[PDB]
C-alpha cells in the first residue's frame, strides 16, 4: 500500500467471491492438457506419418535412372 497506489502480487489471484473456483481451475487445466493433446497428435499424426511416407522408395527410383532402356 502507498498513499496513491496499491499493488497485489498474489500467487493465485482469481476474480471470485467464494473459495469454490475449483470447478473452473480444473476446466483451465483440462483446456491446457487438451491443447497439449492436440499438439502431440497433430505434430505426430501429420508429420511423423508423412515423415515415413515421403521417404518410401527414393533409392528404388534413383537406381532406375541410369537404365538406358
Amino acid at each position: 500500500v502507498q498513499p496513491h497506489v496499491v499493488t497485489v502480487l498474489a500467487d493465485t489471484a482469481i476474480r471470485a467471491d467464494n473459495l469454490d473456483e475449483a470447478a473452473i481451475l480444473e476446466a483451465r487445466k483440462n483446456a491446457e492438457q487438451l491443447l497439449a493433446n492436440q499438439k502431440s497428435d497433430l505434430d505426430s499424426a501429420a508429420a511423423l506419418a508423412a515423415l515415413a511416407e515421403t521417404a518410401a522408395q527414393l533409392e528404388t527410383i534413383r537406381k532406375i535412372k541410369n537404365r538406358a532402356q
Partner: protein, 48 residues
Amino acid sequence: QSARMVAMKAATDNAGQLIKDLQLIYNKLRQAAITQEISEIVGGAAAV
C-alpha cells in the same frame, strides 16, 4: 515454435528440390520407354 517453423520450412525446401528431381526422372524415363517400344515396332514391321 520458432525452431519448428524453421525445420518445417527446411522440410518444404527438401520436398521441392526432390520434386524437381522427380519431374526430370519421369521425363527421361518416359522418353526412353517410348523410344524403346518404337524400336520394337520398327523391328516387327520389317518382318512382314
